[PDB]
Design a protein around this ligand. Structure first.
Ligand code: FES
Ligand SMILES: [Mg+2]
Ligand SMILES: [Mg+2]
Ligand SMILES: [Mg+2]
Ligand SMILES: [Mg+2]
Ligand SMILES: [Mg+2]
Ligand SMILES: [Mg+2]
Ligand SMILES: [Mg+2]
Ligand SMILES: [Mg+2]
Ligand SMILES: [Mg+2]
Ligand SMILES: [Mg+2]
Ligand SMILES: [Mg+2]
Ligand SMILES: [Mg+2]
Ligand SMILES: [Mg+2]
Ligand SMILES: [Mg+2]
Ligand SMILES: [Mg+2]
Ligand SMILES: [Mg+2]
Ligand SMILES: [Mg+2]
Ligand SMILES: [Mg+2]
Ligand SMILES: [Mg+2]
Ligand SMILES: [Mg+2]
Ligand SMILES: [Mg+2]
Ligand SMILES: [Mg+2]
Ligand SMILES: [Mg+2]
Ligand SMILES: [Mg+2]
Ligand SMILES: [Mg+2]
Ligand SMILES: [Mg+2]
Ligand SMILES: [Mg+2]
Ligand SMILES: [Mg+2]
Ligand SMILES: [Mg+2]
Ligand SMILES: [Mg+2]
Ligand SMILES: [Mg+2]
Ligand SMILES: [Mg+2]
Ligand SMILES: [Mg+2]
Ligand SMILES: [Mg+2]
Ligand SMILES: [Mg+2]
Ligand SMILES: [Mg+2]
Lengths: 116, 71, 107, 168
RNA sequence: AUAGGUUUGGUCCUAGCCUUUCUAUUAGCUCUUAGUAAGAUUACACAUGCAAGCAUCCCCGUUCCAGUGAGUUCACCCUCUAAAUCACCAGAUCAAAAGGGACAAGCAUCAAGCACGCAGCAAUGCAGCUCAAAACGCUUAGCCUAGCCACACCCCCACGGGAAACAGCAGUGAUUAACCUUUAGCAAUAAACGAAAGUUUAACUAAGCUAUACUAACCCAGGGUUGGUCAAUUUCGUGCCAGCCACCGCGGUACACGAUUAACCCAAGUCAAUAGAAGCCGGCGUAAAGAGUGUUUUAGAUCACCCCCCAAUAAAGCUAAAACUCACCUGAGUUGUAAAAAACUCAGUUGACACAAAAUAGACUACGAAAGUGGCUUUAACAUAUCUGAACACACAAUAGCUAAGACCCAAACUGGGAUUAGAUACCCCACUAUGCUUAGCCCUAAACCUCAACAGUUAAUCAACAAAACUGCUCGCCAGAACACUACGAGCCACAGCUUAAAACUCAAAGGACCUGGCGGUGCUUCAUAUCCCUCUAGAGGAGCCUGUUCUGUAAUCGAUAAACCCCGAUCAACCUCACCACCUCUUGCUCAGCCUAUAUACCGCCAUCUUCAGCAAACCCUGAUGAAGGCUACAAAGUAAGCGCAAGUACCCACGUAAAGACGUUAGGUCAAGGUGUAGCCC
RNA sequence: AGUAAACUGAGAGUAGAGUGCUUAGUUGAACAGGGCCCUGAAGCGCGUACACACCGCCCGUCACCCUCCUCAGAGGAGACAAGUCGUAACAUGGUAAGUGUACUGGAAAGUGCACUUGGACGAACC
């Protein structure tokens, strides 16, 4: 095992439909600021943020981004205990603004990658 | 017979004595803390006894002796 | 031991079976955290392929990767069976080939 | 080899050889005997050998023992009616003591056979059920009757899957 | 178990692990058909549909059936007696509540629970009840399967609250390795209702899906394995790498890896992972195990009827030898040892002189439970029985150690100095302290070992090995692979760096006990070395120059030998050649039915070094060891006989002497691929 | 012992080439006795944790990667693995070994007091 660098944002993606999941994944794949901060896609799926998503986020010190999905109270409690951050969103550009915010936060400033 | 097992036990015992000598202070502090917590636990046990038995307070003129303290 | 002693002790209080690496389950699901190699104990010499997985039970363990060559990268899901790798100390889980993200060996 | 002198005493085959089954009135049996004395040898060997058999055949009778309490050995049976039967056993061999207790308080072979007849009344051959209680699980086992489908497939005529097609 | 593999250089024993067998789940690869059986991983959350009506209104039912296993000794027998059926009744059947008894697994590092009983009409009085034969407690589990117990979303309950409930059928999200249809019918049986024809029923019946299983079949067969256990591999590729293994193990130029062929086993399956079925009458001197010692109750056993003294212990007193100290005389050295140094000026004779220790006896073998006890006297005193029995208590327990107060001749950790050494925090020398002694308390440990429990009994037909011959009966204590571990945590203790009790995780296939053979021993005794180990004798080398070999340097410039057993060695021989080396140049079927002095002496032949300046090696037999590895010797002989080889003998030289020659089997994978040949691998303009 | 020492030839091999090798011959000595404190040999023994057989085996510290446990971070254990300092044990292991206990020390360990043989004292007198 090796300790992960600070400039590596691990993200779980959860969508209401496969179309939304694919759209978010395309946005992520457009990423080009690899040098300043890597954007790893630990796992993606369709449905409400689940215990397995929280477990992946805990295992990889990642952040779960939910697109028009729900985070039950039990899941919220477990994520709070395990130190994961679940960020639900209902607008694609709001989610993208949040994602760029996290990338800038991980940076050593504002990120240089742009979605369009 | 040979004394290989006795030699193994000898090395174990010598290393244990050396470790105790090397870490006596920490062991003393931990043991004192353990004794204090043991006394508190025993007092809690007696308190449970009488409170469940239905006494508002420890019996008349009763004070729990500190049985786990040297003094 | 006299008959009285046998009666007093009762039947032999056999030790309970102790769970192995897989918590006594045929397979577990893991997420490959890292991939690396390990030198086997003497006299064997090799760089055996291994990975670190967060098993579904919450424990992290080193799983051996059988077969000539593989592709397991980080973040990938694998199934892991028991059975110790004889020449690796402390490694007691084999990644099952042909399941989830670990494809069969290529001819 | 089994521990102890005369390990045969610790075999179900031996404990089933006991021929003494007490009447329902017998409830307690106290055996006073002496650990020494050539006259108490019969009682000593009776306690050593036959007491296991008596207790095995009579699991509800309280059998108690008493060493060197009185000058002579003796049995004493306390019955359900309050009666107490004292049986002197000095100078009698263990076989003689067993025969005497069988005569005075044991159940006769005819009564034992009557109980066995009552028992065998239960297992009616014609009943069908699990092998634990019945000789046959189903009528299929009886030859001539339509066999179990699991072994011999039924005709499409009888099978309900095709009776449905005929219904259609 | 009908067993098998695995500890070692080898054998025997003990022991763990694993293999072979049979199920079930999951996974991988693969799959044709028909009948039948069985089917979420989860007491987590649920969209949707359905699942309880009947009937002249009242009643009855919706408490059943069906479901799950969260919880868990409400399940079984007896007593008593509710509810229900027998058209009203009858007691019969069935069966609640209540009472009595029985009723799972693990942990005692859960040993105390804390009112857990009784008497009396009551008043109230007694102070008791459970528990090492496991109470109280923690963890785990549905069970004893014609089926039974428990739960019904949680708060045990369910007035109430949390909240809006599939653990009814089908189905779904989540979760797990685990994953069936959102079918039809009341045609049959069962239930509910009705007086009844009848009606309702996701109970059930008949269907749907699924190699999970069984049966049957097809003129369309895969899976696994092929080093041993264990059935069965050809050729390639790789070369301690890639990789394989249930265990032992394989791979450094492969019957074990990957491919390929073939074969072997099972076969619509195969077999990778997991789980279960296989688990106490065996042992304790050395393998783990007789707990440091003794004594109870409750109990168990039949071994109960049969039948002189020596050194125990405590107290008191005493002292012979020798020290120390102090006194006279003498002397200048004394101690120290492998040799010295440091150290004291003190040393010798004689006399006085202990609170320390207790020659000879003792070649005795006694006393005590054990630890222990061996100067003398006295006092007190050495339990009981014609059994065993304590972390379950009481009393002891060497030496060391702690607290306090005394003693202190001598010894003596520590400390200092001297010496030694590469260093010497030691071994050797000197001084001295705690301490060793007394008193009074603690501490409670020993290789506390005679590593062999107590009592009773036998020597009869033996006994893995060694040890101190082998056992029988009985009882208690203890042990179940190694290490973790005289450890961690808990508990108790006048203990505070402690003692007793004492685990688990991770790891391994071993660990271990006893022997055999050999090597080794700064190993013992004895006898030797005849140019040999020391001394002894002669002549040399080591100091000088030169010649020559080797190493190191240098160069474009060999190679090999290189401790004895290399170094004027391959060479009884290099200016060219020899020459295999280097630089430049030239040729390609080439002197060769090519060639290579290219690697491999760790594939070899061939010829040799070496102990060997040895006398042993020995096939084939026989015997001993319980028929184990192994061993085989006694001459006033006791299991050895041995062909053959070697030695020897014989031979050359000058004897019959001596020198040659010879010198077996083996060791150093000793040397030589560069005498030559040859296997393998390699270059072929 | 015609040995050492000294001296003089011949030969092999070369076209030539050695202070080298093989060989012939002459003069021609001294000690030869004590031993086993030193090295090896033999015989009988003893010990052995070695068996690639002491150039063996192997202990502990100091540093290095893993796995598990206890712990407010740190320690312990085991494993892998090489170095490091020593040589503590295995032979009388070079100070016999070990148990308990105490002091001391880079580290195996040293010593003190008692105890065990799981060492020997060679086994008539000598
Ligand atoms: S068992 Fe008889 S019909 Fe199936
Ligand atoms: Mg150790
Ligand atoms: Mg399958
Ligand atoms: Mg349960
Ligand atoms: Mg504990
Ligand atoms: Mg409820
Ligand atoms: Mg539910
Ligand atoms: Mg359902
Ligand atoms: Mg689902
Ligand atoms: Mg299934
Ligand atoms: Mg090959
Ligand atoms: Mg032992
Ligand atoms: Mg006794
Ligand atoms: Mg005792
Ligand atoms: Mg003591
Ligand atoms: Mg003193
Ligand atoms: Mg101890
Ligand atoms: Mg301790
Ligand atoms: Mg403790
Ligand atoms: Mg000489
Ligand atoms: Mg010179
Ligand atoms: Mg050279
Ligand atoms: Mg060379
Ligand atoms: Mg030339
Ligand atoms: Mg030349
Ligand atoms: Mg050439
Ligand atoms: Mg050779
Ligand atoms: Mg030679
Ligand atoms: Mg010769
Ligand atoms: Mg000869
Ligand atoms: Mg060689
Ligand atoms: Mg060579
Ligand atoms: Mg040493
Ligand atoms: Mg020594
Ligand atoms: Mg010692
Ligand atoms: Mg010292
Ligand atoms: Mg002793």
């Amino acid at each position: 095992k090796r300790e992960r660098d600070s400039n590596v944002l691990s993200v779980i993606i959860k969508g209401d439909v496969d179309g939304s999941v694919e759209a978010i994944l395309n946005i992520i794949d457009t990423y080009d600021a690899s040098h300043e901060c890597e954007l790893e896609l630990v796992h993606f799926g369709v449905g409400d943020v689940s215990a397995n998503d929280v477990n992946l986020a805990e295992t990889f010190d990642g952040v779960i981004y939910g697109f028009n999905v729900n985070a039950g109270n039990v899941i919220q409690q477990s994520a709070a205990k395990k130190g994961v951050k679940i960020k639900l969103h209902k607008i694609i550009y709001r989610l993208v603004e949040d994602l760029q915010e996290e990338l800038s936060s991980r940076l050593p400033a504002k990120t240089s990658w742009d979605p369009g | 017979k040979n004394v290989l097992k006795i030699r193994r036990r000898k090395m174990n015992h010598h290393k244990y004595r050396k470790l105790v000598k090397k870490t006596r202070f920490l062991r003393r502090k931990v043991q004192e803390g353990r004794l204090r917590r043991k006394q508190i636990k025993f007092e809690k046990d007696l308190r449970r006894i009488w409170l469940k038995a239905g006494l508002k307070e420890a019996p008349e003129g009763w004070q729990t002796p500190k049985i786990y303290l040297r003094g | 031991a006299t008959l009285n002693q046998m009666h007093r002790l009762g039947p032999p209080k056999r030790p309970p079976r102790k769970l192995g690496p897989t918590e006594g389950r045929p397979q577990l699901k893991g997420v490959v955290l890292c991939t690396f190699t390990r030198k086997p104990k003497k006299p064997n010499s090799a760089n055996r392929k291994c990975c670190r997985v967060r098993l579904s039970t919450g424990r992290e363990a080193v799983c051996f990767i059988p077969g000539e060559g593989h592709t397991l990268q980080e973040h990938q899901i694998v199934l892991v069976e028991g059975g110790r790798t004889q020449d690796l100390p402390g490694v007691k889980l084999t990644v099952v080939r042909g399941k989830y993200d670990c494809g069969h060996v290529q001819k | 080899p089994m521990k102890g002198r005369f390990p045969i005493r610790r075999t179900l085959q031996y404990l089933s050889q006991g021929n003494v089954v007490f009447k329902d009135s017998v409830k307690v049996m106290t055996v006073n005997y002496n650990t020494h004395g050539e006259l108490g040898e019969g009682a000593r060997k009776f306690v050593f050998f036959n007491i296991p058999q008596i207790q095995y055949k009579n699991p509800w009778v309280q059998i108690m023992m008493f060493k060197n309490m009185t000058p002579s050995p003796f049995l004493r049976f306390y019955l359900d009616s309050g009666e107490q039967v004292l049986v002197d056993v000095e100078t009698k061999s263990n076989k003689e003591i067993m025969e005497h207790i069988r005569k005075i308080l044991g159940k006769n072979e005819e009564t034992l056979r009557e109980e066995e007849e009552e028992k065998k009344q239960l297992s009616h051959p014609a009943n069908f059920g699990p092998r634990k209680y019945c000789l046959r699980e189903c009528i299929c086992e009886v030859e001539g009757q339509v066999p179990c489908p699991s072994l011999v497939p039924l005709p499409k005529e009888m099978r309900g899957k095709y009776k449905a097609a005929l219904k259609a």
